[PDB]
């Protein structure tokens, strides 16, 4: 029931996100979108780690983007429309009705949770995020992690090169 509610909320916020001209409307819409996407991703995995990781990522990213909102397109008009509110309300109540009259066994995800796994699975009895995150630090794929460290260092070098700090601060009509 909660998964179908998250489906309906993600659909309604995606309709809202496709229709917003103002960057702050897009920012708040993608705030509630990443909240609902973080909860939905959690439902699929045995543990709740990557939802938390994705939330730290997408709250570390738009924290910067608001500073660029206040530095570029700080002055732009909001335009509320009754058509979008009526459309979102009608679609939202229609999908809550459709989710209430639906069989929730057929609409549930086939991905296995921590309790959907059987009792005979001895790997399920370990600590909940151990075997999932193991291959980041194991022998076949530590070199991809090495490549990611060097990639992030090269990324930082690129950011320093193409954002020249000695040219001055950035604003509109600089």
């Amino acid at each position: 029931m909660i998964q179908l509610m998250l489906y309906s909320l993600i659909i309604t916020t995606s309709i809202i996100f496709l229709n917003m001209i103002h960057p702050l409307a897009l920012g708040l819409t993608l705030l509630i979108q990443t909240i609902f996407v973080c909860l939905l991703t959690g439902l699929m995995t045995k543990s709740f780690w990557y939802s938390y990781i994705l939330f730290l990522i997408f709250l570390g990213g738009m924290l910067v983007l608001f500073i660029y909102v206040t530095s570029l397109a700080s002055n732009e008009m909001f335009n509320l429309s009754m058509k979008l509110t009526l459309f979102s309300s009608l679609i939202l109540i229609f999908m809550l009705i459709l989710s209430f009259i639906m069989d929730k066994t057929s609409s549930s995800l086939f991905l296995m949770n921590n309790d959907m796994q059987s009792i005979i699975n001895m790997n399920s009895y370990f600590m909940e995020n151990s075997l999932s995150l193991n291959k980041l630090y194991n022998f076949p794929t530590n070199f991809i992690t090495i490549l990611l460290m060097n990639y992030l260092l090269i990324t930082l070098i690129v950011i320093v090169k193409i954002t020249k700090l000695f040219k001055g601060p950035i604003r509109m009509m600089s």
Partner: protein, 117 residues
């Protein structure tokens, strides 16, 4: 996590009831023309706050974003120490923190952690 959703909705409901009770029991006086105006320390503003703001720490913000996704790859290895090869875990962990120290000390050497000015 389903209980956390319900208690988060209950906290949001309780705070909205608290704010609406603060609005209902507030003193209802008539709105003056210059009461609603922005403060600006007692004088006329000359400029709206929607005027563009100068950013002197753009490089620090993007370095913060890069370092935060670097934080997102450190948090696994608390769990991974008891279940992996100790040699590979130490090579990855000490090489991770030393590469971060090379990057941070190199940008300290260039002075890119200082605000543009």
């Amino acid at each position: 996590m389903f209980s956390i959703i319900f208690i988060a909705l209950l906290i949001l409901l309780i705070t909205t009831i608290v704010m609406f009770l603060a609005s209902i029991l507030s003193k209802k006086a008539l709105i003056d023309r210059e009461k609603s105006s922005p403060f600006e320390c007692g004088f006329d503003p000359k400029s709206s706050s929607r005027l563009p703001f100068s950013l002197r720490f753009f490089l620090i913000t993007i370095i913060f974003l890069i370092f935060d996704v670097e934080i997102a790859l450190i948090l696994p290895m608390i769990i991974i120490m008891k279940y992996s090869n100790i040699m590979i875990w130490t090579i990855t962990s000490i090489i991770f923190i030393l590469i971060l120290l090379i990057g941070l000390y190199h940008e300290w050497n260039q002075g890119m952690l200082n605000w543009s000015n």
